[PDB]
Amino acid sequence: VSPLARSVDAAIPEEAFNQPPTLTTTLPNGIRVATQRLPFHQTATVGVWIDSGSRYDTKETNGAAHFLEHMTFKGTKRRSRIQLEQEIENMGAHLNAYTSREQTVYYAKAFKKDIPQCVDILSDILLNSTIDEEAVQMEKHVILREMEEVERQTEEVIFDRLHTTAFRDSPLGYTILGPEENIRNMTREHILEYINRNYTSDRMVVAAAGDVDHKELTALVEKHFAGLPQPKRSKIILPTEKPFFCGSELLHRNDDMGPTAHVAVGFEGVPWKSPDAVTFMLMQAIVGSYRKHDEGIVPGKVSANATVRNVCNKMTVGCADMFSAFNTCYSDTGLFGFYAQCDEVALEHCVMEIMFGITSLSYAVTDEEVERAKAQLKTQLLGHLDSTTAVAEDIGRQMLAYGRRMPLAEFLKRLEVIDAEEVKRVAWKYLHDAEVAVAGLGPLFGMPQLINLRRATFWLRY
Amino acid sequence: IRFGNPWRDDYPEWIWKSLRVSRKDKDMFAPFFKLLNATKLYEYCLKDNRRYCMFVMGVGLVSSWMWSEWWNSVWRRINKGKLYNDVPYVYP
Numbered sequence: 402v403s404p405l406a407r408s409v410d411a412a413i414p415e416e417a418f419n420q421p422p423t424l425t426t427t428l429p430n431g432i433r434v435a436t437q438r439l440p441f442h443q444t445a446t447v448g449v450w451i452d453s454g455s456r457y458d459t460k461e462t463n464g465a466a467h468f469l470e471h472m473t474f475k476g477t478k479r480r481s482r483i484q485l486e487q488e489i490e491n492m493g494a495h496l497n498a499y500t501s502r503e504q505t506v507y508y509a510k511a512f513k514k515d516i517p518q519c520v521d522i523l524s525d526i527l528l529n530s531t532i533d534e535e536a537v538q539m540e541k542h543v544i545l546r547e548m549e550e551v552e553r554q555t556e557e558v559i560f561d562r563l564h565t566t567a568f569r570d571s572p573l574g575y576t577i578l579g580p581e582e583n584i585r586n587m588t589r590e591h592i593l594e595y596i597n598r599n600y601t602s603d604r605m606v607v608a609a610a611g612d613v614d615h616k617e618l619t620a621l622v623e624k625h626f627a628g629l630p631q632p633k634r635s636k637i638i639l640p641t642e643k644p645f646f647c648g649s650e651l652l653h654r655n656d657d658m659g660p661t662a663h664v665a666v667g668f669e670g671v672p673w674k675s676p677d678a679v680t681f682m683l684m685q686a687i688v689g690s691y692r693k694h695d696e697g698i699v700p701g702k703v704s705a706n707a708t709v710r711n712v713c714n715k716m717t718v719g720c721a722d723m724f725s726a727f728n729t730c731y732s733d734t735g736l737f738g739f740y741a742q743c744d745e746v747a748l749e750h751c752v753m754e755i756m757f758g759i760t761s762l763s764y765a766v767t768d769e770e771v772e773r774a775k776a777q778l779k780t781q782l783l784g785h786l787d788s789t790t791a792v793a794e795d796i797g798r799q800m801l802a803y804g805r806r807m808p809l810a811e812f813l814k815r816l817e818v819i820d821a822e823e824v825k826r827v828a829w830k831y832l833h834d835a836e837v838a839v840a841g842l843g844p845l846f847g848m849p850q851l852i853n854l855r856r857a858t859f860w861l862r863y
Numbered sequence: 864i865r866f867g868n869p870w871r872d873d874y875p876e877w878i879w880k881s882l883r884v885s886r887k888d889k890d891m892f893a894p895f896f897k898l899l900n901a902t903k904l905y906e907y908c909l910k911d912n913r914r915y916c917m918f919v920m921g922v923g924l925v926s927s928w929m930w931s932e933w934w935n936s937v938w939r940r941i942n943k944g945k946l947y948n949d950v951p952y953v954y955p
């Protein structure tokens with residue numbers, strides 16, 4: 402009867418249900434088009450999402466997929482390098498691209514009136530690019546330089562080394578750039594072979610968001626993407642083998658690069674379509690992140706996150722400069738773990754504290770911790786869907802992974818019914834007493850043994 | 864003579880060959896590991912340390928008893944006709 406028991410208990414806000422639909426169509430040649438109209442915008446983002454990457458390179462030509470990225474902006478039959486650059490500038494538009502292990506993306510940002518001219522440019526550079534042998538030799542100097550700057554961003558180097566040792570027996574372990582000797586001996590014939598084997602109509606999605614009309618985007622695509630080859634099958638219906646996960650360590654000791662070490666640990670995860678994928682997203686948020694030079698308004702020593710609290714109070718001074726948990730999904734496997742930076746003499750304490758927090762998911766996590774993590778996850782995910790680019794990336798990425806876009810209300814309904822007993826079930830099945838892979842760099846004299854890390858995945862209490 | 868000689872010692876050629884043999888990707892005992900894994904003993908009795916210790920104390924209690932009983936039978940068979948219970952004493 403107390404007013405303290407008549408509070409407004411609205412689980413999922415009504416705004417989650419009153420969202421504009423994402424419209425989809427499949428064309429005769431196999432290209433898929435997907436659009437969501439956001440009336441409160443004057444600009445728009447349109448792009449092409451392709452289901453190919455470094456994992457679809459050959460061992461002898463690892464690196465052609467990234468090489469092709471650069472050459473796609475060097476000239477066509479109807480436009481030259483200079484002409485392409487000037488046309489974009491004269492409209493005030495933007496044109497970007499990136500390549501990963503399983504997905505490749507090209508997108509543009511411009512006004513509504515300039516959308517057709519963007520679709521024309523995207524189809525041309527993707528289907529009619531001239532791979533001049535003379536330009537292939539010039540780029541070799543711009544790419545060998547990028548391999549030196551990438552070696553200066555340490556976090557990117559550590560995650561590559563983590564893929565190299567974990568997936569030794571699969572193309573999923575290849576690097577995106579490729580070895581040096583492959584870059585030096587690259588020819589235009591290696592690049593054309595990658596195109597003819599990977600860029601087909603069944604592996605491409607066109608997505609848009611903003612002040613966009615669906616029927617008009619479906620007619621422009623039907624006209625400009627007609628010269629796209631269809632898949633050829635030689636009566637071969639053989640399935641792909643799931644990558645094998647190797648428990649191993651790969652460490653670069655170096656006492657001449659300062660007092661800070663860098664480390665990353667990984668577990669075998671789950672693929673996109675797994676019935677347990679949502680729970681892995683949540684488990685990533687329970688471990689969370691921390692930066693010593695950017696705590697915010699909550700001091701780390703009194704944080705609600707148990708992992709942060711234990712790390713900040715270690716030896717009364719704190720044992721980490723920063724750490725963060727990650728979860729990455731692929732088509733047939735995944736990768737779950739954490740990255741960290743720390744002082745030479747603090748490395749052992751730091752790594753073992755974060756391991757202790759992951760293993761707590763199987764034994765002792767509380768519903769207060771789960772609901773704190775849920776609230777943070779919702780604020781970040783739902784907050785990043787503001788611009789037209791982030792929305793378009795969400796459409797395209799989901800069309801390749803799931804075959805559809807999940808509405809916001811469905812995600813929130815699936816996230817709502819996950820409690821502490823369901824977290825314990827999933828962690829007991831996948832993370833408890835499991836194999837781990839490790840990569841590291843720097844002053845590593847105090848690094849734990851691989852077997853120490855392997856046995857920290859279970860407790861002897863209980 | 865190369866064996867034991869600091870002026871000549873080296874491995875013979877048949878030892879260098881044994882070091883070059885390769886059995887990569889072979890496992891003749893694999894059918895044994897498959898059977899063990901199909902009993903689910905790990906999932907039900909060894910993955911949790913509380914249950915692991917129940918398994919230790921319980922199996923040890925029963926095994927120790929069967930071990931003693933078996934050894935007593937062997938002892939009686941080897942020593943048939945020499946033990947007290949095997950030769951009843953006859954009074955005059």
Ligand SMILES: CCCCCCCCCCCCCCCCCC(=O)OC[C@H](COP(=O)([O-])OCC(O)COP(=O)([O-])OC[C@@H](COC(=O)CCCCCCCCCCCCCCCCC)OC(=O)CCCCCCCCCCCCCCCCC)OC(=O)CCCCCCCCCCCCCCCCC
Binds near residue numbers: 858860861
């Ligand atoms: C008349 C004769 C009668 C004699 C009877 C005497 C009793 C005999 C006992 C026989 C026991 C055999 C089994 C041994 C297993 C030990 C426990 C274990 O698994 O350790 C894992 C432990 C942690 O494993 P991990 O891989 O690092 O981490 C895995 C998980 O992530 C970690 O997950 P977590 O974080 O959940 O786990 C943390 C970890 C906690 O880890 C730690 O922080 C360290 C734990 C301490 C080391 C382990 C205990 C054994 C140390 C031996 C001390 C003997 C002193 C001898 C003095 C004799 C004086 C006469 O948790 C524990 O293990 C807590 C302890 C469990 C409760 C107590 C039961 C075990 C005690 C065993 C006997 C010791 C007391 C006997 C005292 C005798 C006094 C007369 O391993 C180590 O710490 C590494 C070194 C371990 C050395 C073990 C040596 C065993 C020798 C036992 C015999 C005792 C001698 C008695 C002499 C009597 C003379 C009169």
Ligand SMILES: [Zn+2]
Binds near residue numbers: 467470471547
């Ligand atoms: Zn590049």
